[PDB]
Amino acid sequence: GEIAQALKEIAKALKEIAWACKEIAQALK
Amino acid sequence: GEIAQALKEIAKALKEIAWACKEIAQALKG
Amino acid sequence: GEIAQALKEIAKALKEIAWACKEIAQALK
Amino acid sequence: GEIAQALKEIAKALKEIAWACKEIAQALKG
């Protein structure tokens, strides 16, 4: 479904935020 | 349902963000 | 309902993000 | 409605994240 697939895109984008926060943690290291 | 399952995927992704922020906290503690 | 329950799972995860941000604050103190 | 109430729970959780971020700013101020 198009609504389901759009929500799936939101989920993938949140994963990008998680990765970026891991990069922040790395910078502090 | 596919909408419900996609919403759960959002929830799972959000937990990944929480864990990453905990890594930020740890990085600041070390 | 399954949608409502999934939305509640999202609220719970957002609380986990809040708690993690509190740990960042504590780490800075 | 249960969907509306669940969305309100999401709004309240986001407010907790906002408050935590204010705690971070406070921590940086001392």
Added chain:
Amino acid sequence: GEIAQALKEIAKALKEIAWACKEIAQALKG
């Protein structure tokens, strides 16, 4: 509608997060 108004509350809560993040930025300049 109750669902639309709940979504609007989520938007308002996200703005609260943006403001808290601006406070973080202010704290770091100071």
Added chain:
Amino acid sequence: GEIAQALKEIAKALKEIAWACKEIAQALKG
């Protein structure tokens, strides 16, 4: 639609968070 427009407001608020995070980046670079 009323629900669609509320979702657009959520998107706009998320963009505000993105800008606040860029402000954090600016403060650290300063």
Added chain:
Amino acid sequence: GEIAQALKEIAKALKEIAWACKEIAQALKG
């Protein structure tokens, strides 16, 4: 659909936050 496209904007806005957070990470490296 208008709701689906609205959700897609939300996805794009979340990506902007991710990029902004990477700017924070880069700022910490500098």
